[PDB]
Amino acid sequence: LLKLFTTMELMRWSTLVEDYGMELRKGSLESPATDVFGSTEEGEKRWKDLKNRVVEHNIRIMAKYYTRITMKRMAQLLDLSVDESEAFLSNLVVNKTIFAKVDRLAGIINFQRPKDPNNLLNDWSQKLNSLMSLVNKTTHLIAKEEMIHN
Amino acid sequence: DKKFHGILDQGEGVLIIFDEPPVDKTYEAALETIQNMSKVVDSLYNKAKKL
Amino acid sequence: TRPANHRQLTFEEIAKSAKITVNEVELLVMKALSVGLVKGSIDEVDKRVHMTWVQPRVLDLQQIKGMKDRLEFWCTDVKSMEMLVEHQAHDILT
Amino acid sequence: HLNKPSIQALIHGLNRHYYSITINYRKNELEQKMLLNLHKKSWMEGLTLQDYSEHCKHNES
Amino acid sequence: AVQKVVVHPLVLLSVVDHFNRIGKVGNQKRVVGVLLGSWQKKVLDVSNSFAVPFDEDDKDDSVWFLDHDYLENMYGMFKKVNARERIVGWYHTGPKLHKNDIAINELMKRYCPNSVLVIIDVKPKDLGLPTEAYISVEEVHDDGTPTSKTFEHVTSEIGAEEAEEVGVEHLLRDIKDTTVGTLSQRITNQVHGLKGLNSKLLDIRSYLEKVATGKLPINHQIIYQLQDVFNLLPDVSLQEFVKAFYLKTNDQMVVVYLASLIRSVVALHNLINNKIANRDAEKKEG
Amino acid sequence: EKLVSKSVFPEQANNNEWARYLYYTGRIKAIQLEYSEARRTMTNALRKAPQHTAVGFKQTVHKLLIVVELLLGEIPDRLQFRQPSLKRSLMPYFLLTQAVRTGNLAKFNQVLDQFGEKFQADGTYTLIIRLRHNVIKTGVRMISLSYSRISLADIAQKLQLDSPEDAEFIVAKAIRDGVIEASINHEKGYVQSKEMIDIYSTREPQLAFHQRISFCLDIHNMSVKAMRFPPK
Structure with missing residues (x-):
């Protein structure tokens, strides 16, 4: 689980529960389950907080990779209702945790920051400079190779 | 009232919000310089009367 | 295989090529980005995946020939532009 | 006589005990085409678009 | 390793002078000398270079005589003159590498473990720097291929110090373009960059043609x-x-x-x- | 027209001579159905008129420009009609412009009845008749400016046309005539005006700036070229 919370890919709450609920809440004689996720009131509160952390990690992964994920797909991937997923995303955005623009009309959750023309042309210039440098380096290696295999 | 930036569309009903591009002060400076040069051309019109 | 210009990959095409369900392509592309094999971006509304690929690949003699003729086109374009600039700016060149 | 003596050299003994000799620098190509490489500017520098952010800032200022 | 080599102007004029003087009396292909410089964190800074007698036979490609005692005595003299300069490699004016360069590189390594071969061409080429620093690399190649001494490449650039800069400025005060981006010089530079790009693309295309026709091996790398x-x-x-x-x-x-x-x-x-x-x-x- | 097409007017001519030639070429073009070129040339001629030196030339240029602009579908500026020197001269043209804008063909007829001989003596009667039979162009242009998806029946009602099919014919003729930029969708019979696009993100601003910069550089070159440096 600790590794799964550091890997940069979605973990589904349904699958995570199906895999770790027995081992994390109840435990066994060979699996001494702790009281962190117990059945007590604090146990349920911390279980809900763990679900919130899982959904936050999922949303972070989407914001890092996606650019425009429909509300339906975001809710499906976060294991939450459409309205609840929208509310969670709005709460995250208000706090400035992540950048998003919930277009409720078309169910669009566009993640990309607005591309000012200066930044776009700067990215193009950076790509061109990298291309030129790589071309020079490949020409140097090419001259080396021609030199060696006379 | 120049509060939160956006425009409504009653056709279907939404509150669109954008980032309000700054103004590009360069164009304001260019227009002011154009006015100044127009009045300088006017002054040269005042001159050149002496041939 | 993409022409390097239409780098956008439709979700249906990836589903057919990899024999993965419609919803599996999202996770597949996400894993590809995560491990470090592609440096693009993924879009769900249009169901098209932006592709910016950094991981290189081994080549074949036919692939090398294709790259060679494409670079020949590139160098001819560069030479044409250089000639145009030189001829148009002969007076200012010095 | 297309050169001039210097007050310093004059004070320390020029045209009195010591006399200067015109110093001519023998430079040749190959030795002048190799030295125009200290700052020769790579081809890339003549195709870099600067950066549009500070370019806009400079234009505005 | 060496992340970069800075060859000061004097090294270049010394290598142009050596090639001229050896060529003027008798005829010899290439000219071999020892490079002296100081080590920064990873940027080797070559400042001085002295000639070393060097006879070779192009036909055999394995016969070559380089003075050991002469090299050591010259290094001792230069240490007496200025001890901040330690031997850092060797240079040869030959435009292309040579089959016996590896043995000479090993001999130089005998005096400096991190030896850089700077090929200082004495033919003015308008497109590119006149230096190409090479180093010796022994690896296993990873990709299941026979390993050999070869010559790994290290980026080279020509810098200068205050005295050398003043000398250069005095020398090239009659053929130097004005410092400042005059539109004429900017447009000319852009044209020069287009020409350099065309030359690099032509070189890459020639290598690709050689690889496709088989004259040269498919690297599988680069x-x-x-x-x-x-x-x-x-x-x-x-x-x-x-x-x-x-x-x-x-x-x-x-x-x-x-x-x-x-x-x-x-x-x-x-x-x-x-x-x-x-x-x-x-x-x-x- | 043949002479103007073949002969080339020197660029380094007097401003007054240029204005006279512009007026003549404007009349030639306007009579020849090149309305846009006539308007541009006559506006240039008015611009190049000798400040306040020739009243009659200004009067004639203004009258012909008013007629040509009315034909082209643009209602002329009222400042011309309000000017002190041109007021009485252009009064009949003011009435004509009123009639054209209001769209009252009867008002146009009574306007012609009173000052028809004056228009004739001014050498613009034929253009006035062309306006009498082209009045609908101004209404179509106003509809194009106002509406974006006007229904064919509604446009026919507004332009007091008899039937919608006549409205369709007139609208297509307008789309050629450079008066409108719409595209009729005959499937549902509504005139869909072209959606406006951000001109700045397009290339037209570059073209305008190129023309202006070329003019400025040419002016500087001409100024520094003479420089009237005296012989020492």
């Missing part, structure tokens, strides 16, 4: 570096990029238009002033 280059292409004609670039071009053209208006107004004012001066002079004439 080749995919060319593939990465071809992936990094800007991909112009995208609608968003086209709109942004048109916006930028118009934003620059408006400033150019304002500058043109200012220039026209200033020229018209100067013309008015000159005309009034001429008319006043004529009137005061009589």
